[model samples]
Target: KYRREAYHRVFVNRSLAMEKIKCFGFDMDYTLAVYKSPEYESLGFELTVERLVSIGYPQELLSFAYDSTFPTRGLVFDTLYGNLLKVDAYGNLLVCAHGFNFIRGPETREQYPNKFIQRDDTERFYILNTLFNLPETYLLACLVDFFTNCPRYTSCETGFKDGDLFMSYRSMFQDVRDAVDWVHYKGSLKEKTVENLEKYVVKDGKLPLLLSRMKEVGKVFLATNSDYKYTDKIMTYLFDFPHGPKPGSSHRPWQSYFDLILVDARKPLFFGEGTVLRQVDTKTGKLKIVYSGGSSDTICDLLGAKGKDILYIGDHIFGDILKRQGWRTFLVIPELAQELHVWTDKSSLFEELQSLDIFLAELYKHLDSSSNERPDISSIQRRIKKVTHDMDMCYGMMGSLFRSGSRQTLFASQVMRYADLYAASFINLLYYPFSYLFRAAHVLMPHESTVEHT
Candidate 1:
């Protein structure tokens, strides 16, 4: 067998013995059926925008299209001031933007004197990190830009005002929030999605093959927030391709792959007793394996959640009970697809940035405050910034999804902290045998790395 590129291989945060696993569970949206992006995002953006318009928002927004280049996944929305922030793992604001207007570092110091924020201030700040929330991220910037420039509105520190009618940024944020929800629940997001499944959803034979293989090793289940009707349409479309686990084998129905399935799984609420479990009837069968409950206690009885042998794969969630109650996690970071490519292809720019740092250090090494003349490193500083830009643009205007400069973004810190394993796609799991033991890398400190065999 050939060794795959590092990007295709899954990285482990904690060692996991796959042979011990008894069951595999999946979160469908970004996990199994990877949505084709920019297009899918555009669809959501257009729909969300229309929802706002129908709610009496000005028709000017109809002209604003989704700008995929502007946003990365790990951004935070400053609801109090209507700004988008890119913060490091420690909540140090790295990039700040008011609508399309980028607020420079020096300017941000006035508000955040120390360039940090307590993420615990959930009431004022909101993080935008999911695939579904991408369009909304772009839309948030759009409204901010549009309203700030519109003649009828006056932009203020906390919000905007049209005559005496004041609209706080928090108020505007809530309106947009409600609009996106209506797009999914009260609008045609699901309807338009199923009508043109292939257009938005990805159909892969490998997905079925993977599921089929997992089924062979142990039990497999799906827990999704989508309802029954939508879930059926999505799973069917995902497996519609011919050939089952092996090529040339007879195509099996999607339902046969999963031992059990949970729909209407309001995950945040699913952790508690928010709703009762009910089986969805599929007329083609005697009794459907479909289900609806997912609380911690209910899951122990349902998916065999009482042991560490179960691997739960999803976009992102802090599953406090996963480890305590015997479960593993695999985070599906779709943005890592781009992140990995940039790291691989832009190796030169990475070196240039590092080289510039070394050059700057050298210039100041021997020369201290006692020097007759200060070292001139302006050109090196400029070159460093340009090289950093070259690398950052490969991902987005906000730069890497998991990092800011040399530091990990808040998103990446959590990715490594919470997930036992992570990869660009959940499909990466298919590369390894079911019994393969995934090992975490040895993290070396500066002193340990610098010493030779003494």
Candidate 2:
């Protein structure tokens, strides 16, 4: 029940018991292996920073920690209009967003001329685009594509008046980002990043053993948002597979091990449609074009009929795991395990902050009620100011801790649903001695929207 409340509770086979999960599906990257945070972002971040420098962006922007707080999961990007925004599960805005300058950010657009905008103001389409395109690597070209086109193409086209200089100016932000990606990927701005994977990606959990054991119990597979070549590079480096040379280098080819691997599968589409799958030659790393086959003969041919029997895992809320109403699922959120640690340390601080906020709210209400008594206004204001100061301080500390722990906490839901059982890493999977025998007797959830994992 505890697990289900926090996550989407799923079962391998309820009657069989927790340890008897049949097929284990895995998401690559943060799920199978963790990437050290700042370390992995180092080269990419530097590349972005340097690009900003080349284009004259205020150096202060470089200081922001590219942490989980700034970017949340399930953020959508509407590519056609160029926007970056986060939406609630039901597709409502959660915070400040980008794109459609004409519709949103009118005040800012009015303030600065030729501000170089890359996204639209209020239009939802532009906002979604930004959310999807923020990552490093594969999407680097997107930044370049937008920056080069924004001024002449996007400005005033979406109902904003002509000579709207803010859109023109804001577009530079995207340019800087593109330039940075070039620096990171093309310039060799920092170390290749694999050496520090343990810091950013690995976590102390039983995932490895659990997954390996699950394999013995049932089949396991990986579906990724990344391309096949990139996926292969990272896996080789992480698993100590001698398959290939380092990510960019030209050497070695390792293949096989996973029962099924899906790449370049545009998720939602990847999940919504049944695309043909092909086996790649292990030695040459080439796709073996299979004309016709079945699951026993080939994995791709089993897509339409066999997917129902297979379990799929992914880290993303929207892209990787497109939820269906009653589907039994497993999710492995790498961050939530990390937050369990942070929560232990900061619970007291949050409590204190909460108490102060309550006190301030009550005090403000009393002061407002007595405003007709002008004689007491100064004293009331002073008291309110003092309370406000304390509240702000508490907010800073509490917000910092919360931000640091955001991703980890958010992952709890996925852990409960996709993971019939849970752990921190692929290594953590190996710890469960009985995992091979475990299957879900049944799964439970508290409400229509909530999951319970007992």
Candidate 3:
């Protein structure tokens, strides 16, 4: 019944018709549930380092503790050359660092000749796509730095050759990835998470209310990559309030809110020709084999809905339900909430930086390019760099994960391209009615705008 004006909080990349959405689907991790800070990422970092040590990495890695502020997600790892890059939407390198050391102009050009990267080449580069990747992203830099500085290890352009065995960064990246997965699949991370849910998982009272409201309007579904047992424990904890739909109402089981529940929905693949889609039994929390292939089609048939009629909310951009599928997407970007706050609070710093840019532009205006006398703008450039770095460090050590000043990072571009609507939390949907018409604001291209008189 409420019309939420807080649409300002929810970023829209594409226009969506909320009224037409007959089914609301959700992804579990980082979507419906938000994990606690430093603790979760720290745990992941520790386990990853432990794995690295086991695989013949130096015992010195144990000395490198996880610095939560040192990393921001959406960084690209150059496996071929051992550099961490922050690139724009078009794959133009904005920031480049060799290990923990930031690389300057000519030095950077030695590796990136064109100042560009072909992101599509998955072999040479690895995009730290998710929040889970943050730990390893920093760890990669740490290990690279450690090896480069150590006299014992022979460091090469690609990676260090330990004795007779040479380990490339690509192989190192894979090992860290496998280790993180092994930690999860082999069951230490989940065990710790479930044992102390209060320390790791965030419990929001508004979750049930939001789901209950969505169910009232149309079919609400839960399609997560997590297995049924883990899903049950997490979901149960999320809804473990003393009361239910309203104040003083009896508490209901988490399954009661969902019209359909699908676990082990290996997404991105789930959108394509996926594995067997199993239907869950609410009574015993078990799954029975139902359909094989094309999860998009199966969900539509089950709900009697079509492409645009379903709205899928998740955290991942590429692997999210949208992609080539017609389903609308609502991205859960927990960082946005804090990023926006920094944007507002640091307006003065930005305004000062903008003024400097304008001054520099005026200084260069009408200057003779053919003249032997060149304008000295090095001082101005130095000031600009300092100010920009100052502004960047406001968010964290790695700066804003989405952008470097005016340039949008690859992560931001993907979110804008794939996610129809996004917010810090999907729970923000509760702020508005299900029938609300969420519209997109048109962006003008360079040639589209007319020159305005000053």
Model 2: residues with Cα > 4 Å off, grouped in runs: 1-20, 49-208, 225-229, 241-256, 274-276, 289-308, 319-327, 353-454
lDDT of each: 0.82, 0.43, 0.82
Sorted on TM-score, best first, the list reads 1, 3, 2
lDDT of 3 by residue, 1-454 (tens): 5434443456678887788889999889878778888889888888878876887777888998888887888989998988889898989998888789988588878889899999889888889889888888888889888878888889988788887889887887788778888887883888788998999989877889888988888998888888777888899899999999787999998889988777877877777777875666655666442222337667888888888888989888874334544788899988887788777888988898889889988987776767676778899888888889899998887789788977889888788788889888988887776677788866666566545545
lDDT of 2: 0.43
* Candidate 2 lDDT by residue in tens digits, 45-111: 6556656666665454455344433444333343323444333322333222333122334543342
TM-score of each: 0.93, 0.53, 0.91
lDDT of 1 at 449: 82
Clashing pairs in 3: none
Every model: Cα RMSD to truth? 2.6, 10.2, 3.3
Deviation in angstroms for 342 in model 2? 3.9
Q: Which stretches of candidate 1 lie over 4 Å from their true place?
A: 1-3, 284-288, 303-305, 319-326, 360-373, 444-454
Candidate 1 per-residue C-alpha lDDT over 1-454 given as tens digits, one digit per residue, 9 for 90 to 100: 5556786698888999998888888898878878888788899899999989998888999999898998888689989889999898888888888998988758988777798878769999998878888888989998999989999999999999967999898999999989989998989988988888878887767788888888888889888888777788888888886677778889888889998888877886776564677677776422246877556456658765465867888996664544336468888888877878788888988787878878787877887778897777788878787777777778888788887676778888778778899888898898899889888866667798868877
How much lDDT does candidate 3 score?
A: 0.82
User: What is the total number of backbone clashes in candidate 1?
Assistant: 1
